[PDB]
Structure formats: structure tokens, C-alpha cells
Amino acid sequence: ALTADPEVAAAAAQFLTPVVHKMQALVVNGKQAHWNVRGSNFIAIHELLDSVVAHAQDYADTAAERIVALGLPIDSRVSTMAEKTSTAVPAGFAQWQDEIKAIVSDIDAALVDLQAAIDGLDEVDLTSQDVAIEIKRGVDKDRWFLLAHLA
Amino acid sequence: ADPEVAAAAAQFLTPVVHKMQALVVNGKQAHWNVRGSNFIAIHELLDSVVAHAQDYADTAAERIVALGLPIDSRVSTMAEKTSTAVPAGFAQWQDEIKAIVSDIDAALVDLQAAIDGLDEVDLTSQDVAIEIKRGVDKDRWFLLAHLAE
Amino acid sequence: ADPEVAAAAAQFLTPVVHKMQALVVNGKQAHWNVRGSNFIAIHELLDSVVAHAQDYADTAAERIVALGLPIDSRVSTMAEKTSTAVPAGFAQWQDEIKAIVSDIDAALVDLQAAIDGLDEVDLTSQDVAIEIKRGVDKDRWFLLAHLAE
Amino acid sequence: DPEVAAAAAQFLTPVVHKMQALVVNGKQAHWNVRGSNFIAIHELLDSVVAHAQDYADTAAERIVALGLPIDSRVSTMAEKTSTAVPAGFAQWQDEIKAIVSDIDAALVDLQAAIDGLDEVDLTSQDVAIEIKRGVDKDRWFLLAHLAE
Amino acid sequence: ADPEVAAAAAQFLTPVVHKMQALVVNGKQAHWNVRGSNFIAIHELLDSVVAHAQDYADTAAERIVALGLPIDSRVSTMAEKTSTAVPAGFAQWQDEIKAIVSDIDAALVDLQAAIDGLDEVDLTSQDVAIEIKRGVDKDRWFLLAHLAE
Amino acid sequence: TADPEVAAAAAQFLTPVVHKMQALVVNGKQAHWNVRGSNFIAIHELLDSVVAHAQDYADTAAERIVALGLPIDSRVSTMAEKTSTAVPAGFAQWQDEIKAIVSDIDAALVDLQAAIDGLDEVDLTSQDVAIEIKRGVDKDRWFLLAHLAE
Amino acid sequence: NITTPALTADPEVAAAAAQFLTPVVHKMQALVVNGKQAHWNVRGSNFIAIHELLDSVVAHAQDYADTAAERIVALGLPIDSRVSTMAEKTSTAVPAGFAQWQDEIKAIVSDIDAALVDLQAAIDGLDEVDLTSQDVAIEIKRGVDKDRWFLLAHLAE
Amino acid sequence: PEVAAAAAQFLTPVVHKMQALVVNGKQAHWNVRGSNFIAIHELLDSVVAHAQDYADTAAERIVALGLPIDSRVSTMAEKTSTAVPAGFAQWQDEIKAIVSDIDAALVDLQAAIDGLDEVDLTSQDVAIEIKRGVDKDRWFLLAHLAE
Amino acid sequence: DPEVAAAAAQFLTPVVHKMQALVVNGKQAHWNVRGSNFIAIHELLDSVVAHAQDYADTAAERIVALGLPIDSRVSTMAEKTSTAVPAGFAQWQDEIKAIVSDIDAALVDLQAAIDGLDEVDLTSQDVAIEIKRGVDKDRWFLLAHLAE
Amino acid sequence: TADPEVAAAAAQFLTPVVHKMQALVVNGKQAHWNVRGSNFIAIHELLDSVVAHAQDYADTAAERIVALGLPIDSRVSTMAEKTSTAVPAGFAQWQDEIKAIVSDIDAALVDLQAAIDGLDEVDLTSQDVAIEIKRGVDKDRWFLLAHLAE
Amino acid sequence: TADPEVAAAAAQFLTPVVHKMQALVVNGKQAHWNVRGSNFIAIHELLDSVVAHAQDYADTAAERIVALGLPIDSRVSTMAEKTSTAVPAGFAQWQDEIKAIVSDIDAALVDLQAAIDGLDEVDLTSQDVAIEIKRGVDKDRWFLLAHLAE
Amino acid sequence: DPEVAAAAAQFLTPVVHKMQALVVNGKQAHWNVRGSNFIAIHELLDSVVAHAQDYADTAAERIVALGLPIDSRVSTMAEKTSTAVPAGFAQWQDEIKAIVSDIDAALVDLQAAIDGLDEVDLTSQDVAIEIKRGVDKDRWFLLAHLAE
Ligand SMILES: [Fe+3]
Ligand SMILES: [Fe+3]
Numbered sequence A: 001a002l003t004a005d006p007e008v009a010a011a012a013a014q015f016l017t018p019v020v021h022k023m024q025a026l027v028v029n030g031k032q033a034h035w036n037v038r039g040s041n042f043i044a045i046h047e048l049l050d051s052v053v054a055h056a057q058d059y060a061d062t063a064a065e066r067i068v069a070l071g072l073p074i075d076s077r078v079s080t081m082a083e084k085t086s087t088a089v090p091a092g093f094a095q096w097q098d099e100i101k102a103i104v105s106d107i108d109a110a111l112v113d114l115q116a117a118i119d120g121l122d123e124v125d126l127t128s129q130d131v132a133i134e135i136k137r138g139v140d141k142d143r144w145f146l147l148a149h150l151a
Numbered sequence B, C, E: 001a002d003p004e005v006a007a008a009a010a011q012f013l014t015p016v017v018h019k020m021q022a023l024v025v026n027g028k029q030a031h032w033n034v035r036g037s038n039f040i041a042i043h044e045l046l047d048s049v050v051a052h053a054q055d056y057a058d059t060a061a062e063r064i065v066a067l068g069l070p071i072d073s074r075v076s077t078m079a080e081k082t083s084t085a086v087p088a089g090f091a092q093w094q095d096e097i098k099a100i101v102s103d104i105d106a107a108l109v110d111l112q113a114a115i116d117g118l119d120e121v122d123l124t125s126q127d128v129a130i131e132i133k134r135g136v137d138k139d140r141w142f143l144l145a146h147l148a149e
Numbered sequence D, I, L: 001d002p003e004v005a006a007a008a009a010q011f012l013t014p015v016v017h018k019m020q021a022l023v024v025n026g027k028q029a030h031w032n033v034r035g036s037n038f039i040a041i042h043e044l045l046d047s048v049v050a051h052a053q054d055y056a057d058t059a060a061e062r063i064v065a066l067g068l069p070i071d072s073r074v075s076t077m078a079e080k081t082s083t084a085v086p087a088g089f090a091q092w093q094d095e096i097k098a099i100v101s102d103i104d105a106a107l108v109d110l111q112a113a114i115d116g117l118d119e120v121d122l123t124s125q126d127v128a129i130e131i132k133r134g135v136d137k138d139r140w141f142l143l144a145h146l147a148e
Numbered sequence F, J, K: 001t002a003d004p005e006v007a008a009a010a011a012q013f014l015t016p017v018v019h020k021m022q023a024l025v026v027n028g029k030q031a032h033w034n035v036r037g038s039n040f041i042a043i044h045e046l047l048d049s050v051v052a053h054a055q056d057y058a059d060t061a062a063e064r065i066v067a068l069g070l071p072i073d074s075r076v077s078t079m080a081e082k083t084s085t086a087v088p089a090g091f092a093q094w095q096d097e098i099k100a101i102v103s104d105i106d107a108a109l110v111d112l113q114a115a116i117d118g119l120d121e122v123d124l125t126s127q128d129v130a131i132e133i134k135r136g137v138d139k140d141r142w143f144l145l146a147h148l149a150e
Numbered sequence G: 001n002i003t004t005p006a007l008t009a010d011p012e013v014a015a016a017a018a019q020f021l022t023p024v025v026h027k028m029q030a031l032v033v034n035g036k037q038a039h040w041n042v043r044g045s046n047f048i049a050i051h052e053l054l055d056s057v058v059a060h061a062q063d064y065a066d067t068a069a070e071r072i073v074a075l076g077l078p079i080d081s082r083v084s085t086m087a088e089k090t091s092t093a094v095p096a097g098f099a100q101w102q103d104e105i106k107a108i109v110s111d112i113d114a115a116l117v118d119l120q121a122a123i124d125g126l127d128e129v130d131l132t133s134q135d136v137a138i139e140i141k142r143g144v145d146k147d148r149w150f151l152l153a154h155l156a157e
Numbered sequence H: 001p002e003v004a005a006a007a008a009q010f011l012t013p014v015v016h017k018m019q020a021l022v023v024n025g026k027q028a029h030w031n032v033r034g035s036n037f038i039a040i041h042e043l044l045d046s047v048v049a050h051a052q053d054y055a056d057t058a059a060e061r062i063v064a065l066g067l068p069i070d071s072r073v074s075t076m077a078e079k080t081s082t083a084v085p086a087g088f089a090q091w092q093d094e095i096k097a098i099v100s101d102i103d104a105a106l107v108d109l110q111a112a113i114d115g116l117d118e119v120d121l122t123s124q125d126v127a128i129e130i131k132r133g134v135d136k137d138r139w140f141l142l143a144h145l146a147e
Helices: A006-036 A042-069 A078-084 A096-121 A126-150 B003-033 B039-066 B075-081 B093-118 B123-148 C003-033 C039-066 C075-081 C093-118 C123-147 D003-032 D038-065 D074-080 D092-117 D122-146 E003-033 E039-066 E075-081 E093-118 E123-147 F004-034 F040-067 F076-082 F094-119 F124-148 G011-041 G047-075 G083-089 G101-126 G131-153 H002-031 H037-064 H073-079 H091-116 H121-145 I003-032 I038-065 I074-080 I092-117 I122-146 J004-034 J040-067 J076-082 J094-119 J124-148 K004-034 K040-067 K076-082 K094-119 K124-149 L002-032 L038-065 L074-079 L092-117 L122-146
Strands: none
Touching: A006 A042, A006 A078, A006 A096, A006 A126, A006 B003, A006 B039, A006 B075, A042 A096, A042 A126, A042 B003, A042 C039, A042 C123, A042 E039, A042 L122, A078 B003, A078 B075, A096 A126, A126 E039, A126 F040, A126 F124, A126 L122, B003 B039, B003 B075, B003 B093, B003 B123, B039 B093, B039 B123, B039 C123, B039 K040, B039 L038, B039 L122, B093 B123, B123 C123, B123 J040, B123 J124, B123 K040, C003 C039, C003 C075, C003 C093, C003 C123, C003 D003, C003 D038, C003 D074, C039 C093, C039 C123, C039 D003, C039 E039, C039 E123, C039 J124, C075 D003, C075 D074, C093 C123, C123 J124, D003 D038, D003 D074, D003 D092, D003 D122, D038 D092, D038 D122, D038 E123, D038 H037, D038 J040, D038 J124, D092 D122, D122 E123, D122 G047, D122 G131, D122 H037, E003 E039, E003 E075, E003 E093, E003 E123, E003 F004, E003 F040, E003 F076, E039 E093, E039 E123, E039 F004, E039 G131, E075 F004, E075 F076, E093 E123, E123 G131, F004 F040, F004 F076, F004 F094, F004 F124, F040 F094, F040 F124, F040 G047, F040 G131, F040 I038, F094 F124, F124 I038, F124 L038, F124 L122, G011 G047, G011 G083, G011 G101, G011 G131, G011 H002, G011 H037, G011 H073, G047 G101, G047 G131, G047 H002, G047 I038, G047 I122, G083 H002, G083 H073, G101 G131, H002 H037, H002 H073, H002 H091, H002 H121, H037 H091, H037 H121, H037 I122, H037 J040, H091 H121, H121 I122, H121 J040, H121 K040, H121 K124, I003 I038, I003 I074, I003 I092, I003 I122, I003 L002, I003 L038, I003 L074, I038 I092, I038 I122, I038 K124, I038 L002, I074 L002, I074 L074, I092 I122, I122 K124, J004 J040, J004 J076, J004 J094, J004 J124, J004 K004, J004 K040, J004 K076, J040 J094, J040 J124, J040 K004, J076 K004, J076 K076, J094 J124, K004 K040, K004 K076, K004 K094, K004 K124, K040 K094, K040 K124, K040 L038, K094 K124, K124 L038, L002 L038, L002 L074, L002 L092, L002 L122, L038 L092, L038 L122, L092 L122
């Protein structure tokens, strides 16, 4: 996809690439939490986590395709993703409160990156900014549904 | 209940979870970055490879957990245990297919070991491995038939 | 037919029909009577268990009938052949879960014996028992996961 | 008082037992039915079973919503119900007569629930009236086959 | 017509409209502000209670309008005729359940009054109240079972 | 982590949106039930869709507030203090129902436009919620109003 | 052979259903035919809204005829709703050709009014006799009362 | 007016007979008895839903061309007759009675196809489509008596 | 014989142009219609547009299926068609009359196709017949509103 | 190394299954069109369901052989050479169509059991394919034959 | 009382169409399973759609014959005597699968046109069946052949 | 402020015209496309067409909802619009290139709308941004085919 302004494409890649890596990692780590969660709220949190993962897969895809449509590649191979990301999700079985605290922590780091994209794209490309804004609304809502459980 | 039955099954199935889950991530990579004369049909087919891979990853991982054992499928553990030929950047559809087929071949090696090895251990977990192997053998053919020429 | 092939399946699949269909009735009982902080999630979870049990009971019974033998699964015969831990009246969700898992664990013994017993005799009926065991093992995990810690 | 909750359980409890028993004995007929009408009757019996399970759930939960438990364990249900459904294979005409006989007994309980709840609780009465409309229709779909 | 039939419908169903419509708004209040260990299940359950209450308000109101009489359920009038135990802000789920159960109990008084009052007047409008009462009694149990023991 | 000031300022802009939208649900139903006249079925139906949109908008705005970590007071008593309606008490011709609901919508549009201008310097994510609500509300207003054009 | 289960299990309750629901079936079934006539022939400024609203009134009337008829038959007595009988037992204000939508509405409401009289008589006559059949009449009266309002509201005020 | 007139001449009998078939097929559906009850009760409902569609299609064809249709119950009854029994009947007899009503409708359908042929091929297509469906329905019914 | 394809192209091409034009001009009437019947007519015109797009597709694909190109570019379509749809806001009665006038012109061409394909290609003729059935019905749905 | 015997065995054991399932589609359609008598609608529909299942089993078996890298010859001419039907050439009573279809099914079950036996030692993934087809076909058989238990 | 000529003409002109469409299901599946090369997935899928359409057309044309009171013989053995295919025995490139399929479709179209012309004086209802099948087959043929336009 | 509605009409009007023209020229390309990618490109063009028709409706109804008419008659649309889509049969690479060219022109107008609405009306700006996001994506799906 060409195109007209290499500066617009370069800004989208710069601000949206970290969003892709963190959303795609949240699919893999969210799956881990969903399989390994235990305790009194299992079925609800098991299912809430699968929701979060479905959302994160869709956000990863939207952000990535926005980049590619502007004519730049994205490297989101597993090795790259793992170099660029970190998770607090436990290695094995864990009580639901603890999986929520871990997922909320990964969500918090994605939000830092989404907010950086919103500010960064504001004077360069409002169309790519809108992608980060839409992702941010969905993630802020997921974060509330997770965290409401701990209050 | 024999805990070595569950542990042995987890040992056969864990590589399948790691490889299927990496196939989801690396297939998305190929789905985003593919170019060339067959773009739309391959971009769509890779997405359906990915959706199958995610299901197979879920089926295998929840067999392990149903057997009572945890599964370490964190991003960090997955990268340590898997490797991909999917290119880093834009690539022609033939090259994307070849690389996804190579990742699949390595998954089929672990599925065949799981099928052989579960035969003496746990037939219900064997069946999970056969079911994933049927589906994966079919994706492999859909991909490879494009290069037959 | 081979007269033994049919007789082996009635013998191994019959107790699965009886326990699966008893699990529909006692599942409903738990579903109606369950109380406490997790009511809505467990009320629905149990409904899902009942729906699976009903499907599994049909699949096993219809496999037996397809091979040409009758099945006696009247209320009276089922009560003779089955037992339940589900309480008579209101009970906290933890206790409903333990009671149903107990009932499942008994079904699992009969499924595993059908899997072992069908192995050199009728692989088509063995597949029925395997397919039912997979779903029952998963329903047991969803129930049991609630009681960890 | 609610002696009003107690009346629901008295009049609706029989309904839960007979409907729930109809799910099991209905499935028995469905599996074991034979002969020239197999597929229409096998299907129709599966439809009667689905209805029965719904009615059992509606009656039971009406009782629980009022505050009283229900004992519908397999043992209690067997003690309080009887079936004419044959132990094994049987012609479609015989399965019908057996099932209609099981329906006729439930209908007796539903009518006693309608009459009994009339001066006590119209909301529970309405549950038994709803179930009786469905069970009356099921009985006709079955029995019209033998009309002949 | 006989104008006393429409008049008794409006007299006994109007409070059902006001309290069902109020339960939609105050239900949404509790749905948004609910907090604690059971959040997702209770947040969803309350949304279902709100959807039922909206349907019930509609059914009762259209029965009145179909008999030829108007209904005043503007916000101002509905606020004069109803009150709520739902808190102004964030609250634990046990407290939201108790507040909403309180509101349901007042609507139940009015439903039973309609059922009794419409019995020698209009059995078609009586049936509308009976249908709403069946749904509200079930909703009430779903909420209240979470608090039991 | 994240500026409580931003959240607090955003809740202030969105809170009137929630009260006005939730009131349009109740007032719109009022109009839906009591509307009369030659256009009854079309307008009775349009009002139902207006009510269903309004309820979604109330839910999106309120959920945005709570996602920012703040409570929302939308009890009936509070909503009645902060809102008023032109919808008649009883039976009304469809022309009069449209003019009343348009007047209620117009007042919502004032709060919406204030959210949009004010959130531009506070939170663009919250501002997008208000923009999405105003696009739908604007459209609903035209569908109502086009009827009176002649 | 045989003979066995009775087909008409309660002949007095059967007879009450047939006595009170038969007129319901004939008028509901007639409403389907005459509703379609109005649906086809309606003209004027409200054409499309009215054309469609008449189509739902027709679909309701068909389902109510079916519910009423199958209640009678389930209880064990036949129903004669052949075209010749329904025509003897029913009449319509619906015009023979094209008619403006207000006049179609008035005609349909007049046919619904005659149906409502039969439904109220059924609700009253089944009251001490068969509450299950009564419930069928109540359910139909609720939906017919609502369709009457939808039609009639158009002519207010 | 010529095409409108031809449409009215040929499709009007189709409307009357299809709408009658709805009412008389409903009668057969309620009152059918016998070893084949469920399959025939359900098959008769499907014939009734087709007949209602066919009436609606033929009727709107006439009206779209500018002529009214009188399909009130009194007019339909004056123009149609049925062999459907007044009460309970065995399914073999409901099928013979319904196939009789259908044979009558087929004669009017074929007349409409022959008569619209020099006049209006678009109205003629309505008659053909109805006939295809009604021939199929007649076969589903009649196959049951083939032995 | 290449003259089957040529006849279809000859009789179906004006049908594609007028149906495609009706999508655009009907969208125009859809956006700009005002007055007491707004929502009903705004919806009805969307439905006319959806049908017209389908008719255009069916006719054009019949031509291409027979082996011949179709020139339905905007520029060509505009040379070949005219509309009475007003430039701006108009009352619903006026939108209906202007769309009925564009439909009447489409009917002249459909009828010429039906007559012209009669001795040549009954399969292409069936395409014209099917489109004409649907457009005759649309015209009535519009016009009935003005009967009074 | 890779192993060709796994593929050749699948083709050996699954190919009769493809041809017999595919011929059942065509002969089952024949019985479906030409069936007559007291049970016509129920049998006519039943047979359509058996044909839908048979088409699925053919596809499943074929694509298994293809996925393993080997071609399948299932042209009409080849299929006709390798298969045979008891279905009558013209109209037949439903009891006779049922007997003819059950006979075609019985022959296909012989090949499925040979495939299940033959694949046990060689390729359990393909064996599974045959087991799944056999469960469906065994059940189709019963639904048909139950009508003759009379 | 029914004209024996109407039935006989429909059997005469529609029976070849049933044989050719039913064969196209079988040979189309063969092409679907065995196709290869750069357009695999798009043609694999396009062939399944042509197979489904061919099955629907087979059904429609056969049911028209039986509705008129005549049986039809579409057993595998008869269908094979009466049809032939160019679809290859094994793996083939997608260009050659398209060409083969088009060739089978061209043979069906000559029979469709013969039905349309021959039913014109006898039975317009049966001619309509042939007309409808021909519109769909002419479209399938275009979708296949346009790939070879380069 | 009627300067708002006037801004939306100024900036959104070229969007309505070029999207609506893309429907007609997109159908032309979809009908006439040929070559080794026929079915995938035939289907992709139908999807671009369906998006374009929705983008046109969204932009036009934004203008109308603000209280201004829109002239999108065929004749006005043709005056304001140009296509590079060939008159007849063309290879899929040429149709892609022609359509992409038509999409590039729409994107200039979309960008002018985004930039021009920024200080006037953020609600109409958002319409243009949403349209631009979908149009950028469709352009990529088309153009990725030509990367070799
Ligand atoms: Fe999972
Ligand atoms: Fe919400």
C-alpha cells in the first residue's frame, strides 16, 4: 500500500507497533490465565478472561492492519514479541484474584502505550489516532470489569 | 488415579500447546505481511489456519488442565520452546506458505509423538492429539497445494 | 452382526447410559436447590452439565440400539442401578459441586472400564466412550476448579 | 403463611416428579421404538421429552422461587412415579399407549393443581395451566395416530 | 364498552408501570455501580432484571392504552410515585442485591393488589399482572439466592 | 498510574449526558405509548428506536465514567432533579409528540456539544464517546423532524 | 386393535371448548381472509404502513385460529371450519374493491369488535368449567385487543 | 387496461382457489387422524403456507396492474367448493380431498398460462411459478396413496 | 451463432443503465425526502434502491455470462439516462412521482426486452420478466400512496 | 525419513469408502425421487438425510487421502466400475427402497470395518476417519431398518 | 385425464439434464479434491459451489419428471452409460480442471437448450425448470471460464 | 451557527460524489474483470462497492441531518467525477489499478475533509475519519495484489 506520506506511515508504525506487541502478548498470556485460573469465581473469570483475549486479538489485528495499510511491515513474530514484552501472569495454577492482578498489570502497560499513540498521532494522523482511541475505549472497559472484582 | 498418567499426557501435549499457540502468533504475522498476486485468498486462508491453531491450542491445554496439571504457556516460555521461519517483514505469498508449512511440519512431529506415546498411557488424551492431527494435516494440504505449481 | 460385538457394547455402554441419565435428574435437582454467593454461575454451570449428560446418555443408548440390542433405561431400572450424593433440599454451592463431582467420578469409572473393555472388540463403540469421557473430564474440571484453596 | 408457599409445593411437586419421570421414560420409548412409523414417532417422542423437561423446570422453579426446596432426586422420583413404558423394543403403537398412560396420570395431577391453587395462588395456578395446555396438545399428537 | 373495566385496569396497572419503569432506571444505576467479588455475574444479572422490567412496564402500559386510557409515566410523575433503596454511588454486590430486592418487594405488593383487584373485573388484564408477577418472583429468587446462608 | 483530575473532569462533562439520555428512555416510552393520529404506527415504531438508542447512549456514557473510576448517581430521584420534559401527560397527536421529543433532544445536544468542546483538552477517548453519541442523536433528530418539514 | 386410551378424555370439558371456541375459530379464520382482502386493496397516504400492519393482523389471526381450533380438537371433538361453514357463520364490512386506508381500518376494527364479543363470551363461559381453555381465550383476547388499538389509534382524535 | 383485464380474468380464479385452500387445508390439518397423523398434519401445514403465498402473489399481480380483487369470504365461498370433510377423517381421505381441490386449482392455472401467453408474459410467469409449486405439493400428497 | 449474445446485449443494456441510475437517483430521493410520511417513504425508497441494484447486477451478468462487455461507467450511464428526481429537498408526494417517472421509463425498456428476446433467447427473456415483475410491484407500492 | 506406506495404506483402505459413499449419494437420490407409498414423506426426507451424510463421508475420506499426498480417482466411470446398487430403476414402495439402501450400506460397512482393522497398525489418524464415518453410517442404518422391525 | 404428452415430453427433455447434473456433482467433486497450483483455494471453493448448484438442478429437474407421474432411472450404472467426463483421473492443475469442467457444462447446455426448445410447444411449466437451470449453469460457466481470459 | 452545516456540506459533498461514483464504477469493474484471479477480485470488488455505498449514505445523511440538501443526481455526480475503469473487459491487474486510482482521488477529498472540519465540527470530522479508515484498508487489499 504505497503511499503519499512516508511521515504518516512512519508515525503510525512508531506509535502503533508497541500496541500490536502488547495486545498480541495479552492474547497469549490471557490464555495462560484463562487455563490456569482457580478458586471460587472460576467459571465467571475463566469466561471474562476469554473475552479479554478475544478483544486483545481484535485490537492487535486492527492496529497491525492500520500499519500495513499505510505501506510498512510489522514484525510480530513470537521471538520479537517476547523481546518487547513482559507479563506478570503466573507460570501455573493461581487463584483468580492473582490472575486478575497480573492481567490488569499487563493491561496498565498497554494503556501507557495507547496513550502515547493518542498524543503522538494527534498532530500527524488523525485516522491512525482514531484506531488507538478505539482500542483504548475497549481496553479501559476490560480493565474496569477485571478490577471491579477486587474493590 | 495414577499421577504419572496425567504427567506423561502433559509431557506429550505441552509441545502441542506451545507450537499451536505460536502458530496463532506467527500465522497472524504472515496474514498481515503477505503480498502478491494471491493476496486476498492467502490472507484469508492464513486467518483460518490461525483460528484452527487457537482452537487446537485451547483443546490440548484444557486436556492437560482437566487432567489436573498446570500449563506454562506464557509468552516467555513459548518463545524459548518454539522458533518460526515466517519472515520478519513483507514477503510474497509463496514464501509465507513455505514458512507456515515448515512450522506445521514441526508441529506434526510432536503430534505424531503424542499419538504414538499416548497409545500406552491414555487413549482419551490420544484422541485429542488425533483430532488436532486431522485438522492440521488438512490445513497443510490447503497451503501446500498452492505450490504443486 | 458379530453377536459378541453387540453384547460387549451393551455390557460396557449400559452403565454409562444409566449414570448419564441419572446425572440429568440429579443435576437438575442440584440446579434447583443450589444457594449462596455463587448461585447464578453454578446454577447455569449445572444446567450445562445436565445438557451434556443428556446428550451423552443418548449417544451411548443409540449406539447400543444401532448395534441391535434393547436398552432398559426406565425410571425404575435406573434407580436400581444408580446412587446420588445430591442433597434432598437446599444446599450451598460448594456442597452441590462436591455431590455432582462425586456422581461424575462414578461415571468416570464406568467410562474408563468401557474404554478398556471395548479395545479389542469394537473400536467404534470405544470411540463413543472416549468422546463421552473427554466431555465428562472437562465438566469435572469446571466444577472442581471452584474448590481450589 | 405463606401457607401459600406450602400449597405450591403440595400441588406442584407431583407435577415435577411426573414430568421429570416422563423425560426418562420418554427417552426410553424414543430409543426402543420400532416399526412402520419409526422416524415420525422417534422424533415426536423427542419433542415430548423436551417439553416435559421444560415443564418440570418451570414447576420446580416456581416452588423454589416461593422459598421451599424440592426433592427430585432419582430415588424420590422413582418412589413417587410408575411407568408402563416397556423394558425393551416395542412397536410404535405400544410406545404411544404407554406414553399416553404416563401423560394421563400427569394430567390428573395438573388438574388437581389447577383446582387446588384456585383459592390460594393464581400465579402458581397459572404455571399448572400453562403446563396442562402443552401436555394436552402432546397427548393429541400422540393419540391421533391410533384413531387410527 | 363498560368504562369501569378500563378504569380498573388503569387503577391497578398504573403502579405496576411506575415501579417497573423505575426498576429499569434504578437497576441500571446498580448495574453501573456494583463492585466486589461477584461483579461480572451480578452486573449481568442486573442487566437481565432491567430488560425484564422494561418489557413488563411496556406490557402493563399498553394494556392500559389498549383499553382506551392514557398513562402518565413521564420522569417527573414516576419520581413522585416511586422511591429506591439503590445507593447513590459504588456499592458492594450484596448491598445492591438487597436494595433491588427491596424495590422488587414493593412492586410485588402492587402486582398482588392488581391480581386481587382485577379478579372480578377483567380477567384479561388480570393475566397481564399474573405474567409480570411470575417473572418478577423468579428474578427475585435469582437475586436473593446469592444471599442465602 | 493515571491523572485523577482527567477522570474527574471527564465525569463532569458526561454525567449530564447520562441523565438526559436515561430521561429520554422514560419520556420516549411515555410518548411511544400515548401517541395518536394518522401516523401512529410509523411514529410509535420510530419512538421505540429512539428509546433503544437513548438507552445504549446512557449505558456507554455511564460506563465510560465508571471505567475512569468514578461513580455515577443516576437514581430516579436524581435524574428527575436534573431533567425536565416537554412530553405531554396523556394522549397527544403524533406532531406534538415529535416536537416534544425534539425539544428534549435539543437540550441533550447542548450537553453533548459542551462535552465535545470541553473534552478536547481533557481526554480524547472520552471525547470520542460523546462524538459517537452526538452522531446518533443528530440522526434521530432529523428522522423525527423531517416529518414536520411539511 | 384395540380399543384403548379414550381420545376425548373429558367429554363435558370438550363440549365447553367446542361450544365457546368454535365461534373464535370462524371469526379468526375469516379475519385472515378479509384481512388479506384489505391488505391487497388498501390505497392512500398511509399505504405502506397500513399494508404491513394488516399483514401482521392477518398473521396473528391465523395463529389464534390455529390455537383455538387445536384446543378443541385436542380435547376430542371435531371443528367444522370449511369455507362454506365459515361463510355461513361470519360476515365482513371490508369493501369489495379499492378503499382508502381509513375505511379499511374501520372495516377491520368492526370485524375485530364482533370477534371480541365472542372472546369475552368464551372467557365468561369457560370460567367455571375449564380454566385451561379459558386461558386460550384470554391469550387471544390480549393480542386482539392490542391489534385493535394499533389500527384504531390511527383515527384518533 | 387490456393487460390489467387479462390478469384479472385469469388470476382471479387462482386467488380464490389458493385462499380457499388455506382455509380448507387448515380444516384438513386440524381434523386429520390415523397412522400417519404427524407427517400428514405437518405436510398439510406446508401446503397451506404455500397456498397463502400463491394467493398473495397472484392477488398483488392483479392489483399492481391497476384492478381490484374481491376476495372477501362471502365471494370466495360463492366461487369455490371443497371435498374436505366436515369433521374427523382418516389421513387417506384428507389427502384425496385436498388433491381434489388442488386438481381444480390446476385447471385454472393451466387456463391462466394458455390465456396470458399472447398477452402478458410477466403475469404468465406468476401463473407458471404457482403451478410449479402446486404440482410439487400434489405429488407429495398423492405419492402416499401410490400404495 | 453470435447473434444470441448480441441481442441480449442490445435489449438488456438499457435495463442495466436505467436500474443502475435508479440506485443513484433513488438514493437521492431517499436522502432528500421531507414531510408527514418521511420514515415510511425513506424506508420504501431504500428497498427500491436495493432491488434496483439487484436488477442491474442480474442483467449485466446475464450479458457478460453470454460473452460480451458492458459499459456501465458513470459517464456512459449519465449519457444514457435522465431523472425527474429534484436536486434538493422535496415533499414525499413529489419524490414518489419523480421515481415513478424513472420506473415508467425502465418499464418501456423491460417490455421491449421481453418482446425483443421472445424469438431469440428465452433465457435472457426470463431475466427481463423477473426484473419486470419486481419493478411492477415497486411501482404499485409507490403509486398506491397517491391514489388518495 | 518420511514414509510412503502410511499414505499408500490410507489410499488402499479409504478409496473403497469414497466410491461407496459417493455412489450412495447418487443411488440414495434415486430412491429419494422414486419412493412411493404410505410413508412417503418421512422416507423421502430420511433418504435426503442419508445422502447429505454420505456426501460428507465421501468428502471426508477423499480429502484424507489427498491430504496425505495421493490422488483419488472418483470419476463417474470409475465409481460405476467399483460399485453396485440394489436400488430399483423406477418407482418402488418405501419398504423396498429401505431394503435396497440398507443393502448398499451393509456393503459399505464391510469396507469401513476392513479400513478400521487395516489401519490399526499403520495410521490411527486415518483409522479415526473410518471410525467417525462408521458411527454415522451404523446409525443411518438403524434409522432405516427400524421401520421394518414391524 | 392429464395429457400423456406433457409427462412424456418432460421425461424426454429433462432426463438427460438430470444425468448430466448428477454426473457433474460426482466429477465436480473429483475436480475439487484433485485440483492443484497457484489458485488452489479459490478454485477448490468455486468447484464446491458448482457441485452444490448441480445437485440442486438435478433434484429440480428429476422432481419435475416425477411430479408429472413418470419414474426416472438415475442409478450410478445408468448415469455412467449415459454420460462422460474430461475431468482427469488424478492430480491436475487448476487450469485443466477448469477446462474439463467447462467441457462437461457445455454438453449439459446443449441438452438444456434442446429442452427449452422442445418444451416450448408442450409444457411451459417444465420449460421454466430448464430455463432456470440454464440461467444458473450459464453463470457458473462464466465464473469458471473468466479465469482463462488470462 | 449555520456555518457548521455549511462546512459539512462543503467538505462532505465531494465525499458523497466520489463514493457514490465508486459504487457504479466498482460494479463496472466487478462485471468486466477477467484473468487468473477472477473470482477473488470479482468478490473483492463487490465488497469495495458495498463499503462505498455505505460510506456515501453516511456522509450524505450527515449533511442532511445538519439541515442541508445534497444534489447527488446521476447528472451532477457525473459532472463532478472521473473514472479510469475501462469501458469493457479488462485483466484483473488493470481493474485494480483503475479502482485504486479512483480510491486515491477519494482519499484527497477525505483528507481535505478531515483537515477542513478540524476547527469547525468534530462530529462531521469523525464521519470522514471513519470513512477514511475503511477506504485505506480497501486500497491495501487491492494494491497488495500488485506488490508482485
Ligand atoms: Fe478455553
Ligand atoms: Fe451496561
